[PDB]
């Protein structure tokens, strides 16, 4: 059956067989771990269907695939059902893994601006805009006589007008039409992010780790979109060829072009299936780190030093911050957790921390009278004179609230003894406003051997 | 004309 040979060359063939096993043996391995170790163990469910439209698409397009599109042009040797059900399956599972991809897209940016319901809504939708493969597909004999057996091939069943709607359809609703979406929503997500990076930068020493957590999101998230760009432009470029050259343009050098070119764009597509394993791996590291970092927030403002030491050893974020840019350190100073401000410390949390209203762990630890973590503070080279955007220094907060013991720390670490904040009130004028005799004269005399060096 | 979609 002359008229229906390919003629791509052997080492073609065995070249992209060799790929082609690559990809499933890996890949089929690759996308069944993921499944068996989320079995074991939100973001989750999205990932469980992509290791899963990619698993069976690896596990029955590519082996079908392999053997009569590769291989063994002509004939079909796998019935009307298999035909319309191989390319029934490919449908469904590239609707499943871009409507998902959207939702991933859509969830990120809603993020930064049930869930098992909505992912059987995504595979039966699959299922839905695939059902036209069903029609359309089909075993046809286009041998001399019009009956020879070797001339059954699976091959489109309808006219070409009718051909194009569908393909155009497809290439529109599978392709375009959810990655522009998600292109469009990442590069708003990633806007809204670069505002909130500015706005910290501005105020605080260390950005929060939810921002941290979806910044590194918005990059996955876009390398995932340019995967697809390249992994299913080639494809769907190939399928638009096969219905919009008619006959008439079909030369023996474009046809010969088309096959290998058939090899090749579906190369890459079963490329974009065995990657996704990445994506997963990728995401889940992102996701742990972020909950790590919550973890060790609790556990600093809990005051549970195992916990602490269980996080800092197992990778957590030493200076990771909540919205206010508050770290573990500050929590500690704050809490009142001497042991935790010291393990802090050692694995090299910043001592000089600000956080939105310009608070290191030095302010909150002379606010709420902690001398000895005041003392520790300042023994790791806390700012002694560090001011918030008040203009307050520590030795005012301690002045303030009566921290004698701390008043004559702070002084006796080079503490200005004379320092104003917005209102012009020095740390003495607070230590008299509210009564704190004692500390009041501790100041003054501070301030008169001040004056004395001035004169001499 | 190719047969292969």
Same mark, same amino acid.
């Given at each position: 059956?002359?008229?229906?040979?390919?003629?791509?060359?052997?080492?073609? +063939?065995?070249?992209?067989?060799?790929?082609?096993?690559?990809?499933?043996?890996?890949?089929?391995?690759?996308?069944? =771990?993921?499944? *068996?170790?989320?079995? #074991? +163990?939100?973001?989750?469910?999205?990932?469980?269907?992509?290791?899963?439209?990619?698993?069976?698409?690896?596990?029955?397009?590519?082996?079908?695939?392999?053997?009569?599109?590769?291989?063994?042009?002509?004939?079909?040797?796998?019935?009307?059902?298999?035909?319309?059900?191989?390319? *029934?399956?490919?449908?469904?599972?590239?609707?499943?893994? @871009?409507?998902?991809?959207?939702?991933?897209?859509?969830?990120?940016?809603?993020?930064?601006?049930?869930? +098992? +319901? *909505?992912?059987?809504?995504?595979?039966? @939708?699959?299922?839905?805009?695939?059902?036209? $493969?069903?029609? !359309?597909?089909?075993?046809?004999?286009?041998?001399?006589?019009?009956?020879?057996?070797?001339?059954? =091939?699976?091959?489109?069943?309808?006219? !070409?007008? &009718?051909?194009?709607?569908?393909?155009?359809? /497809?290439?529109? $609703?599978?392709?375009?039409?959810? $990655?522009?979406?998600?292109?469009?929503?990442? &590069? =708003?997500?990633?806007? #809204?992010? !670069?505002?909130? =990076?500015?706005? @910290?930068? *501005? /105020?605080? &020493?260390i950005e929060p780790?939810?921002?941290?957590?979806?910044?590194?999101?918005?990059?996955?998230?876009?390398?995932?979109?340019?995967?697809?760009?390249?992994?299913?432009?080639?494809?769907?470029? #190939?399928?638009? $060829?096969?219905?919009?050259?008619?006959?008439?343009?079909? !030369? &023996?050098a474009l046809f010969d072009f088309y096959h290998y070119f058939y090899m090749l764009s579906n190369a890459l597509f079963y490329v974009s299936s065995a990657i996704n394993p990445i994506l997963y791996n990728l995401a889940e590291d992102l996701v742990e780190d972020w909950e790590k970092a919550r973890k060790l927030l609790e556990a600093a403002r809990k005051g549970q030093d195992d916990e602490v030491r269980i996080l800092l050893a197992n990778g957590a974020d030493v200076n990771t911050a909540d919205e206010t840019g508050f770290t573990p350190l500050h929590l500690a100073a704050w809490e009142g957790h001497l042991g935790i401000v010291e393990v802090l410390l050692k694995n090299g949390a910043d001592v000089n921390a600000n956080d939105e209203r310009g608070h290191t762990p030095l302010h909150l630890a002379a606010y709420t009278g902690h001398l000895e973590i005041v003392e520790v503070l300042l023994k790791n080279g806390a700012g002694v004179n560090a001011t918030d955007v008040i203009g307050t220094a520590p030795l005012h907060l301690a002045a303030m609230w009566g921290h004698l013991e701390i008043v004559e720390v702070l002084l006796k670490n080079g503490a200005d003894v004379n320092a104003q904040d917005k209102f012009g009130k020095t740390p003495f004028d607070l230590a008299i406003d509210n009564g704190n005799e004692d500390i009041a004269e501790v100041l003054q005399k501070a301030a008169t051997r001040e004056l004395e060096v001035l004169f001499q | 004309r190719p047969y292969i979609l």
């Amino acid at each position: 059956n002359s008229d229906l040979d390919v003629n791509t060359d052997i080492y073609s +063939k065995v070249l992209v067989t060799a790929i082609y096993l690559a990809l499933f043996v890996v890949g089929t391995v690759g996308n069944g =771990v993921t499944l *068996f170790t989320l079995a #074991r +163990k939100r973001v989750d469910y999205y990932l469980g269907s992509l290791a899963l439209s990619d698993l069976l698409i690896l596990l029955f397009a590519l082996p079908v695939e392999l053997y009569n599109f590769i291989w063994v042009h002509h004939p079909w040797a796998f019935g009307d059902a298999g035909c319309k059900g191989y390319y *029934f399956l490919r449908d469904a599972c590239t609707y499943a893994t @871009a409507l998902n991809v959207v939702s991933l897209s859509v969830e990120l940016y809603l993020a930064i601006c049930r869930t +098992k +319901k *909505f992912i059987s809504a995504i595979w039966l @939708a699959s299922a839905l805009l695939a059902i036209p $493969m069903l029609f !359309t597909m089909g075993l046809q004999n286009l041998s001399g006589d019009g009956t020879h057996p070797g001339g059954l =091939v699976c091959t489109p069943i309808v006219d !070409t007008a &009718t051909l194009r709607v569908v393909i155009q359809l /497809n290439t529109f $609703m599978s392709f375009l039409f959810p $990655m522009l979406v998600a292109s469009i929503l990442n &590069t =708003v997500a990633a806007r #809204r992010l !670069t505002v909130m =990076v500015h706005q @910290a930068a *501005f /105020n605080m &020493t260390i950005e929060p780790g939810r921002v941290q957590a979806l910044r590194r999101g918005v990059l996955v998230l876009r390398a995932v979109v340019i995967a697809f760009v390249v992994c299913w432009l080639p494809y769907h470029v #190939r399928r638009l $060829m096969f219905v919009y050259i008619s006959d008439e343009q079909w !030369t &023996t050098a474009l046809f010969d072009f088309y096959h290998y070119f058939y090899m090749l764009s579906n190369a890459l597509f079963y490329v974009s299936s065995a990657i996704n394993p990445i994506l997963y791996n990728l995401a889940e590291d992102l996701v742990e780190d972020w909950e790590k970092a919550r973890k060790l927030l609790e556990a600093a403002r809990k005051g549970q030093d195992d916990e602490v030491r269980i996080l800092l050893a197992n990778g957590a974020d030493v200076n990771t911050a909540d919205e206010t840019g508050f770290t573990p350190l500050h929590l500690a100073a704050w809490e009142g957790h001497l042991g935790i401000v010291e393990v802090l410390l050692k694995n090299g949390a910043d001592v000089n921390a600000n956080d939105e209203r310009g608070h290191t762990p030095l302010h909150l630890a002379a606010y709420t009278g902690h001398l000895e973590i005041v003392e520790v503070l300042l023994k790791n080279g806390a700012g002694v004179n560090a001011t918030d955007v008040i203009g307050t220094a520590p030795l005012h907060l301690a002045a303030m609230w009566g921290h004698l013991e701390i008043v004559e720390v702070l002084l006796k670490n080079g503490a200005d003894v004379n320092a104003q904040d917005k209102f012009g009130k020095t740390p003495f004028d607070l230590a008299i406003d509210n009564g704190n005799e004692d500390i009041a004269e501790v100041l003054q005399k501070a301030a008169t051997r001040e004056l004395e060096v001035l004169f001499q | 004309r190719p047969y292969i979609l």
